[PDB]
């Protein structure tokens, strides 16, 4: 959709394969803090939160724990001790038009810094004086939702990168999303050590 009021999904009650995650071909950048990719493939959790969105290429460096910038200070801000990984794809074809793939309007005017995971979708007029632009014009009539103008002439740094961030919660965990090892046919008619689900 947009980095403005991003899209989310709460995965639970499944077997997290990961065989494609960070192993598909067109992935551009993937990096997690606290967890190794393979450990992730053997780690287990209670629930998962996926938060996908689209940002400008030159702003990918701002999606990081406590990282400071524009998109990470006034648009969408992730905690400082956030453990998990993000992945970003250069959608320089998937979301772009010579006419301007700016359907999405990122956030450029905010009253106060963001709390971690604070959806702040709003339609107001940041201003200086008494009234907003509904009754004033020129001075103090600013609107935080600015288009991107994604078009192909834009260089890489300004190509819409689609980014997806995974956050594993572990409080009180009747963990419903696991399963890295499930095979090997049983030997019969011989004294054998078996390990049936423990």
């Amino acid at each position: 959709a947009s980095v403005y009021a991003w899209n989310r999904k709460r995965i639970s009650n499944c077997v997290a394969d990961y065989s494609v995650l960070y192993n598909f071909a067109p992935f551009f950048a993937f990096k997690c803090y606290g967890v190794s990719p393979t450990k992730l493939n053997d780690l287990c959790f209670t629930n998962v939160y996926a938060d996908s969105f689209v940002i400008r290429g030159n702003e990918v460096s701002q999606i990081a724990p406590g990282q400071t910038g524009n998109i990470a200070d006034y648009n969408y801000k992730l905690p400082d001790d956030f453990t998990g990984c993000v992945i970003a794809w250069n959608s320089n074809k998937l979301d772009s038009k010579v006419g301007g793939n700016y359907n999405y309007r990122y956030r450029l005017f905010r009253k106060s810094n963001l709390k971690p995971f604070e959806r702040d979708i709003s339609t107001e007029i940041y201003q200086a004086g008494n009234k907003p632009c509904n009754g004033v014009a020129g001075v103090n009539c600013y609107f935080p939702l600015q288009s991107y103008g994604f078009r192909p002439t834009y260089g890489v740094g300004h190509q819409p990168y689609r980014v997806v961030v995974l956050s594993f919660e572990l409080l009180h965990a009747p963990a419903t999303v696991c399963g890295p090892k499930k095979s090997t046919n049983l030997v019969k008619n011989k004294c054998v050590n078996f390990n049936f689900n423990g």
Epitope: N70, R110, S112, T153, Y154, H158
Partner: antibody
């Protein structure tokens, strides 16, 4: 009228400190995107610093680690502390309110010269 | 860090005629620009931002153009007071950062 008036400009011996101040009128600063610019005699301009509306500030790389912006919100004014002024920092400093895509920097300050002993 | 180069350096044109000023970029600046006229003695003044949008008040006599790595400002009829320095400011990277040009000296007769 809408304006930005500056202070702190002067002369100081190398390694010394200084503090630049920026006052405004008929317009607020606490809730306004602020940007300090400077100009060496005869050359172009360069963005020096910025303070946001939440407090998270930023500085250029050439002056990173040495200058610190602050603002007395109570009386609608901006400040920039400088230290260890070397031969480069001799310049005229300007105060600016930059909006960006919705109108680029417009209202500026008369400027203020800041030179060093030599 | 896109380095901008203005051209020409100086210009002396008879009153009443047209004037053409070029501003040259080193990378893709699409339509992120602005033009400032810094009359000698005080801060600059914005004339034309983005690609060609005329800043409020700014006489229609000015016209900006160009995109990519090359931009141009054009003046219809220079009056005696148009003599000043002009700078093309780009902002393809708004998040605190900016990079200016070398300036152009325009005079009359």
């Amino acid at each position: 009228e809408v304006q930005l008036v500056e202070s702190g400009g002067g002369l100081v011996q190398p390694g010394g400190s200084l503090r630049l101040s920026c006052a405004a009128s008929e317009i607020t600063v606490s809730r306004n995107y602020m940007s300090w610019v400077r100009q060496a005699p005869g050359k172009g301009l360069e963005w020096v610093s910025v303070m946001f509306a939440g407090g998270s500030t930023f500085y250029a790389d050439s002056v990173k680690g040495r200058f610190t912006i602050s603002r007395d919100n109570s009386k609608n004014t901006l400040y920039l502390q400088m230290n260890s002024l070397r031969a480069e920092d001799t310049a005229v400093y300007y105060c600016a309110r930059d909006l960006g895509v919705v109108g680029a920097t417009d209202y500026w300050g008369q400027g203020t010269l800041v030179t060093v002993s030599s | 860090e896109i380095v901008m180069t203005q051209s020409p350096a100086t210009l002396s044109v008879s009153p009443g005629e047209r004037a053409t000023l070029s501003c040259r970029a080193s990378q893709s600046v699409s339509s992120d620009l602005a033009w400032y006229q810094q009359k000698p003695g005080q801060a600059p003044r914005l004339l034309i931002y983005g690609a060609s949008t005329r800043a409020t008040g700014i006489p229609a006599r000015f016209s900006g153009s160009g995109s990519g790595t090359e931009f141009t400002l054009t003046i219809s009829s220079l009056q005696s007071e148009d003599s000043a320095v002009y700078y093309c400011q780009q902002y393809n990277n708004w998040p605190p950062g900016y990079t200016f040009g070398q300036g152009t000296k325009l005079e009359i007769k």
